[PDB]
Point group: D3
Chain length 165, copies 6
């Protein structure tokens, strides 16, 4: 269990096994970007290869944005799907998941996308919003048929968030 | 008239007055990103402030992607609107524009977006696809009510593209 | 109250409300650069727009540099004004401010600059030096007539510094 | 045929089909780094995924370094193998190749490495040195059993180099 | 003679022997930053070590900034000295130099700085402004007692500037 | 005593006096790169000049890589010497050093390299591997005749590593 503090965003989280941070400037403004390592370990001290088709972004969800956590996660999930999967397609295999992060509750919206382009692998996106009983945080786990969202690990990641105090 | 070569993308273009390049790594793979300067000139040698709500991206449009140039620009324009304006809204003031870049023809799709969020300024996007009589290039000019797309300048930019030979 | 640790510089500080970190390489050598967010929140996970004409830099003040804290802040303030406002002008509205950071005392030097160029907004700079009773830290808050130095917040920032132990 | 100028290094070359530039700071000092695209095209304007286990570096070969071109390429090839494949192994399938770039001649040294680690794919490296009849340039193409050196394309790349005049 | 084009700035120049480019983002907005190599050549493909106390910056000099070229170079030289040598000192060994870049004339202002700090090496700065008979370009060569401005090479650099047409 | 946490790598260490961090992306994947400051302090807030010929890299040593700690450090030291000192030479002045980091033991391998090139300064490399009684970390301190490895400080750095819990 590797715990990571995000001081600007006011939270800590547990890094999922198999993932590293990428693009550390995210922390400057209270977010974090994670990538999934692939292949054999790199030379010591050098960055590991990471997958191209999956990513996790998490962070503080601005108070002015999105308004229950169920509605907020569904709305944020739709917006994230446009932002990261802009191509035409159809949503399938949708789910909503209740989140309970040590008392701070939330909700997540998951769906898969069958694209119009027959050559494109299906997309997958899990978007969670979790709050204290009013600071809020989001978790977005993006994947594909080839690197699927690990839904259990996405819930565990969101439920690992703790406010820094 | 400032002409800029993009060797990896196989084209040159005329830089619009008032714009500079940003994020030069775009050229590594045959694209270019431009930003609009704002304010007074910076100290000599230092980067100019640029606007936050408008941008131009242009580049070679991969042969496997998008299939007339009219259809290609409409499809690329829809995808670019999702990618850059992911929030819910309605398209208004749509236009299609014929392009003729020194014999190489093309088409552009323009639309404005009235967002559901009453506090968000309307979005604007112009997407052009232009080809030789089969290399193709795209031009996307993104703006808002506060920094509108200059449609004449967007057409001039797309019609300024020339293949490098 | 968001507290940020700067391990290389040996201090923590309270992030001012409305500010984020920029250019995280500053922390590699014991300094921090902050920028002021502007506009509506960005898309979640993306960096916020920041103001162009105001900035905060803080850090450990090297033992070989600058020698009371009153003299040190005045000298550092003059040097910072040259470095960040190199253009000809006149200092006006000067002030010196006593600092007391939980027992560790210091001083700050503030001044405004009326530039010779009538089209340039006046500049403003607040420079504080604070020490333990001999590690020392500096705080420089730069602004303009359009984004003024918040002198109360600058004093609060300097008086929020605590040594890491 | 996409020709790329490297002004600091004083040469141009033909970009191999299927490759893009990476890490453009190389050009600041007269070198170039290329990476091999993988997968489907990225969203227009965005960087393509590239392979992790193959790369090309080329550039001006400093006059003080390495001294026929046959000896120079063999020595540079040994050094490049240490730098990029530092792990213990055995060289196999060695070859030397004569180069003739429009009158400017040179030589290349190729070898494969069977590593001691049974789980590591074999390494492959092609190192060419080519000169005018005394400016010199190098080309290093690194690969593995999974992404082999394309020896014909490596020779074509080195023989595509032309001095800028 | 290595000629470098700066398309956004609308000029080309001759790279001084012994110098490389640094921080290529300068070209995005029409400027260039050069650094002086030190030591033995680096491993091929890797960046050369450069000196820490000398630099050249050149670029298009915005039409709204600075107004003969004699006055412009003196004013820009004073501002550049504040920006790059902010510490208290005295100017000594001042010179003004006429520039003639293939018909486009200009002027440069040089001075050395004896700092108040006895441990600081003297600073040196050469600032040139050159124009067509109304586009203008600047050249600033910064050095110290340990890496002096090469005044002949600075004049040659400014007189090497040619408009791109 | 400045202690630095590396959350992704699961350890903290004591920063050696005279060293700063460089290239902070190392922390994204559980490693750290340190550089040695040179010269007078930089302007406050600006990065210090660092030496070109010495560096420290440390990090978590992947469980699949390298298998006692004596053998692991010798093997990693050979690989690091190829990676960082690829040129032909002879090892001299070899040493092995036992490490005891607050109960977690390890070993280091040191050697100097006399290069074939008479103009190249001798190289020096110290490579340590230290473990809990099975997480492991490495420390590599690279130097030259002109900036030698400080062997006492390298041992102190490795023996300063503590797991984060």
């Amino acid at each position: 269990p590797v715990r990571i503090d995000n001081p600007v965003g006011g939270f800590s989280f547990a890094l999922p096994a198999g993932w590293v941070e990428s693009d550390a400037a995210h922390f400057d403004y209270g977010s974090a970007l994670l990538s999934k390592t692939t292949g054999d370990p790199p030379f010591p001290g050098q960055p590991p290869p990471v997958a191209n088709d999956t990513r996790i972004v998490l962070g503080r969800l601005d108070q002015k944005l999105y308004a229950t956590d169920s509605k907020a996660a569904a709305r944020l999930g739709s917006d994230m799907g446009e932002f990261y999967m802009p191509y035409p397609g159809t949503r399938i295999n949708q789910e909503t998941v209740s989140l309970d992060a040590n008392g701070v509750s939330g909700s997540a919206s998951y769906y898969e996308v069958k694209f119009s382009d027959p050559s494109k692998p299906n997309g997958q996106i899990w978007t969670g919003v979790i709050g204290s009983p009013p600071q809020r945080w989001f978790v977005v786990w993006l994947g594909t048929a080839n690197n699927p969202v690990d839904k259990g690990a996405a819930k565990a990641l969101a439920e690992s968030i703790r406010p820094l105090v």
